[PDB]
Amino acid sequence: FIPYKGWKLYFSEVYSDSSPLIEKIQAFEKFFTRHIDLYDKDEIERKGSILVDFKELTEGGEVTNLIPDIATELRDAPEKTLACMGLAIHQVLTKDLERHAAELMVNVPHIHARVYNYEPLTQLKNVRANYYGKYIALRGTVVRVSNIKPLCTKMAFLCAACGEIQSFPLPDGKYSLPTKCPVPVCRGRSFTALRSSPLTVTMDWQSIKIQELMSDDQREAGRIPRTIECELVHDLVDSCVPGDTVTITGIVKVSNAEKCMFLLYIEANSISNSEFSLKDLYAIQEIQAEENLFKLIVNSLCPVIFGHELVKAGLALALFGGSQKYADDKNRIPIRGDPHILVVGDPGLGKSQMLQAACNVAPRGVYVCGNTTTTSGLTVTAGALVLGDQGICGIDQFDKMGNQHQALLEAMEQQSISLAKAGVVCSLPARTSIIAAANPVGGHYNKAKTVSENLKMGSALLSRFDLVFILLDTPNEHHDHLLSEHVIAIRAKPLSERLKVVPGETIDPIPHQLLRKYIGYARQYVYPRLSTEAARVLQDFYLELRKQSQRLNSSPITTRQLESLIRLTEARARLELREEATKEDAEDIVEIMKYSMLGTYS
Amino acid sequence: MNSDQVTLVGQVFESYVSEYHKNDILLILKERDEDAHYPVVVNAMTLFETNMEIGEYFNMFPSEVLTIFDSALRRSALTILQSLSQPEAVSMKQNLHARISGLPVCPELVREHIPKTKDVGHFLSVTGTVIRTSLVKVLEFERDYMCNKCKHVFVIKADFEQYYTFCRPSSCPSLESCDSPTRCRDYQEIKIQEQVQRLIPRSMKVILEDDLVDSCKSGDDLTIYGIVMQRWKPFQQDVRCEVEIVLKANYIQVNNDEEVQKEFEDFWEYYKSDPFAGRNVILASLCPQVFGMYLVKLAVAMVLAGGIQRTDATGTRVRGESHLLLVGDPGTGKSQFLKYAAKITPRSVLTTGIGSTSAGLTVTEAGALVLADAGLCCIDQFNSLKEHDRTSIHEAMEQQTISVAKAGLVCKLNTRTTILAATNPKGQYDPQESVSVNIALGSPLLSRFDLILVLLDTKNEDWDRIISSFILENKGYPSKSEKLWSMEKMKTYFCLIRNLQPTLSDVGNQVLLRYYQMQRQSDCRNAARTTIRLLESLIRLAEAHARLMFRDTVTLEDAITVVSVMESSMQGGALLGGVNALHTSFPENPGEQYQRQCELILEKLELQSLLSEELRRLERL
C-alpha cells in the first residue's frame, strides 16, 4: 500500500504517516517531476547519480517556497536531507517506467544523491572540533592515490529454528550481532554467518590524501600545511591521478583505532575536476590601460638596483614565455616554447638580486644554490626541476658545478625526464625556464683573451641557451657618481634610451602582489602567433648573420637561433595582451639579440 | 536446477566427446600409472553452435557444468573400456578433469582489465605477465573423522571461501533424532600484472590447483580461463572485515583481418611499372618533419627492417640483426630520428645514456638491454658512456646473450636488440683523421657497427634559404597531396613484413663475393672495416632490403642498392667517391638513376654477362 516501493532499501523504519519528512518528500518529488525532461535515462539507470546543482535550489523555486529551511536543514542534518533526493528520484523514475510500460516489472536499483556547487568555501585550518557531522566543502590536490579493496555493508545472517532469513543492515563495516530478530514470533539469537547468499552486497573503496595549496598567510615557519584523508564509497574511484586541482564536498566524520584517541577524515559526496575575482579582472584591465606598459613592467621588477635595462628586459621576457607548437597532431614531437638565459660578468655588479625578484614574482618558483645539490638533487630521485613545473627554477653559482653539467641537457631539451634507476621508463613531465648566473673562471675577466677559454664551457652547453649576457666593470666618471648618489640616497631611438628614466618624473612601480596576478592571467588566456610581415625581418637577420659568422670565429650558428628568434618574438606579445606580430614587434627583438651576439663578440 | 536439465546437459557433452574426441581418450587410456591425474582439452565454439540451449545453461552458473562434464567423461571412458578389443595394454583411471577453451570474442568476456567488484561467479579471460611465484605445497581435503554417538560415517568436505578451514558439525543429517589422512592435492600462488602496452596497473593474485602447478614461468605472457570468487577472513569484534578478489584457474595458455592485406597487395600491385615509386613513398613518410636527407632516411628503414637468425646444430648461433651510429655537428636532427623511431617499434625503451647507470646497460633485476628483447633500445650521448660500461657491452652486442656469474650465481639471459647510436664529434671535425681519430674509439668496438654515416655542415646558399622558409612559413608537409601516411599504417606495415623469410639466389651472391674480394685489398683497405664481419653484414643488409618490397627472392637490384649505400657509408677512402648525406634530395625519376647506377657498377667489376640480361629484363616491362 506504500507508494514508495523502495522503502526497505531506503530508510529503515516502520511506515507511519507522522514524520515531518513527508512534506519534504512531496516538495522534492514535485521539483524533480517538473524538471524531468533533461536527463539521460540510461546513465541514471546504470550508474546512480543525479548531479543536482545547488544554484537551481537557491533560485527561489518551490523548494524554498514550500519550506524555507533548506540550507540550515542540509548543514545540520547530513543524511535526513540528503536521502530525500534519492527517495524522490526513485519514486519519479519508477512511476515514469510504470506509465511507459502501461502505455505500451520494475526493479530499479539504488540511486545515490549528488549535491555539488556549494558556495561558502570553508577552507582548512579551521576544522578541529566544531565541524562534526556538518556538510562543508574543500579544495586541494591529490598526492597519495592508493589501491582498491571491497567491503560489505548488508551481508546476511543465518536463522534459528524455522527459516525466514534476514539481511540486517550492518553499519559502516563494523561487525555486530542481531540480539533481536523481527520474524513472526518467538526467540531471536540466530548468531551465525551465511556469507554465500546473494543477499550479501559489496562495493568498492579507496583512500586519498589531500595537501592544501599555498593560498595565503606566507609565514616564515617551515610547517607543512595540514592534510586530511578522503574516502570514496561507490561508482567513483579511478577519477583522479597524482597531481590535480579538485574540489571535494562531503560529510566530516571521526575514525577510530588509529583507547579514546581518534583523528579526522571526510567521506566524499561529490567530486569535480578542472579562479579570478571580479576585482582582479577590473585591476588587470586598468593595468592593460596604461599608455607605456613595457616601461612600467620592466622598471618595477626590482627598483633597488640602478641601471642594467637590457638584462631586466630579458628577464621580463623570460617570465612570460612563448607558445607551444603541437604541429602534426598524429605524431607531434612537440617543441619547447620557453627561453633560457645565462648571465656572466664580473663580481660586484649585482647579479644576485635581479634573480631573487624574478623568482618572487612568479606563480610557482624555487631558488637553489649550486653547492648543496648533486645530480640526485636537480633530477628525479621529486627533484628541483619537477617542483618548478610551469614556472622558473633559477640556479645560482652555475660555473662551480663540474660533475652535474651533463645531467640537465636531456631534461631541458627533451621537455621530459625519466627514472634515474637504470632508466626503466616511468617518465614525468618537467617544464622549466632555468635561469643561471655565474662568474668567470679567473675571477675578474681580462679584456685581452679569447671568449672560449674565459667561460670553461663546451660547444654543446653554450649553444642551448638563447641569451648569454656578458657584463663588464669599467671605471667611468658620470655613471659612478650617479650610482654613488643613488646608493647613498636609498640609505637616507635605439632600444637603450627610451627605457632610461630622465630625472624629474614619477615612475611609481606596481606592487609585486598585483603583478603576480597579471602573469597568471597572461599565460592562460592568450596564444600569440607570428604574422607575415614580421617573419621577413627575422629571415633577413638570419641570412646575413649566417653568411657573416660562418667564416669568422664564434659559436657555430645552428637552426636553433631561428627557432629562438621566433620564440622571443612570440614572447613580446603576451606582455601587452595581444595576438599579432607587428613589424616593431620583430624589430624590438633585434636590438636585444645584439647584446650577446655580434654586437658583443668584438 | 531442474532434474531433466542436468541429464540433457550430460547427454549433450557425452555425445560430443564420443563423436569428436576418440583419439585423445584412447591415448589417455593407454598410459601407465593408475590414479595420478589426466586432463582433456575440449573446444567451446563447436559445442555452443551444435546446441543453442547449452550456452544459456552454461554462462549463468559456471559451476555445475564442469562436474557434469567430468561425469560425462567418466561414463564415456567406462563405455569405451566395456567396448574394447585389446584389454592387455590398458589401464582404467579414476581421475579425469575438464578444460574448456575457445571462448567467443564478445567484448564482455575478453576483458583486459581486472573486474572491480561486479564480476563474481562470471567466467572471464585475462592476459598479463608474471611477477612472483610461491613454493609447491600439499593440502588436506576431507577427513572422514571418527563416528561418535552414531553409526554412519560422515564425509564432510572443506570450504574454499574460508582459507581452507574446517567447521565443526553438530547437527547430523541422520534420519533419527540422534545428533552429535591419505588424501592429497596440489597448490601454488602466482601474481599477475596487467600489461602496459595495451593500456599504473594493479596486480591480480591468481591461485593454481591440481595439474596447473609447475606450469608457469616468471616473465611470460599468460591467458587464464578462470572463475572469479571471493575469500573472506575470520571476523573480529568491532573492526573492519577484510575481503579479497582471487581467480581460480581452470585452463592455461603459453601464448606469446584480410582487409589490411588486400589493401597492401592493392598498393603493391598498382605500382607495377615503377617499383621504386613505392619505395620513395615509403621513405618520404618517415619522419616527415625534416626536409631532404635521403640516404639517412633510407638507412634507418633498412636497419629497422631486420633479418633472420640462423643457428647451427650443436652449440653455435650467429647474429641476425643490425646496428647504426650517426656522427655530425650539433643541429642536424639526430634526436628527432631517434624519437620518431622509438614509437613505431612495438617495444622500445628510451634512455639518456650518460645519465643511465650500470644497472641498465647490464644485469644487476632487469636493466635495459635485457628488457628490450625483440625490440629496439635507443642510445644517446655515446661520447663518454662510462668507459667501463661502454666496453662491458661487447659480449651482448655481438653474441646476443649475456654470460655473468656475479657473486657465484651463474645466471644466463638472452638479449636480442638493434642498437641506434648518435654521438657528438668531440674536437673540431676534419675531413681526414678517420673517425677512430676524431672520436677516439677502440678499433674492436668500431667494427661491430654496420653503417656509420657522417654529417657535415658546409657553405651553401640554397639549403639555408629552403630550411629557413620551411621553419618560418610553417608549411607542414610541403607536398600538399593527400597521400601522406598515418602512423598506424606505418606501424602495421613494419610489424607485418617481419614474417617473410627471403631466400638467396645465384644472380645475387656472386656480386657481393666479387665486391668483397676486390675490397679486401685495393691500396689501403682502411684499417678496421675490412674484416670478416663486412661480408656478414653485406648479406644481412641486402636481405633486409628484399623484405621491404614484398618478395622473398633477392635479385640484382637489391645487391646494387646495398653495395651503393654501403660504399657511400664508408667516408673518405672508397672506390667510387664520397657524397655528403645531408645534401641529398629525392630524385624526380628513380628508374633512370637505377639504370645509370647499374651500368656504372657492372663495368669495372667484370660481370658483363649479367648486364645484358638485366637490360633485356628492364626493356620488357
Ligand SMILES: Nc1ncnc2c1ncn2[C@@H]1O[C@H](COP(=O)(O)OP(=O)(O)O)[C@@H](O)[C@H]1O
Ligand atoms: N646598481 C646597484 N645599486 C645598489 N646596490 C648594488 C648595485 N650593484 C650592486 N649592489 C650591491 O651589491 C650586492 C650584490 O652583490 P653581487 O654582485 O650580487 O655578488 P656576486 O657577484 O657574488 O653575485 C648587493 O648587496 C647590492 O647592495
Ligand SMILES: Nc1ncnc2c1ncn2[C@@H]1O[C@H](COP(=O)(O)OP(=O)(O)O)[C@@H](O)[C@H]1O
Ligand atoms: N631539417 C630540419 N627542419 C626543421 N627543424 C630542424 C631541421 N634540422 C634540425 N632542426 C632542429 O634542430 C633540432 C635538433 O637538434 P639536435 O641536432 O638533435 O640536437 P643534438 O645535437 O643535441 O642531438 C630540432 O629541435 C629541430 O627543430
Ligand SMILES: [Mg+2]
Ligand atoms: Mg648571488
Ligand SMILES: [Mg+2]
Ligand atoms: Mg641531442
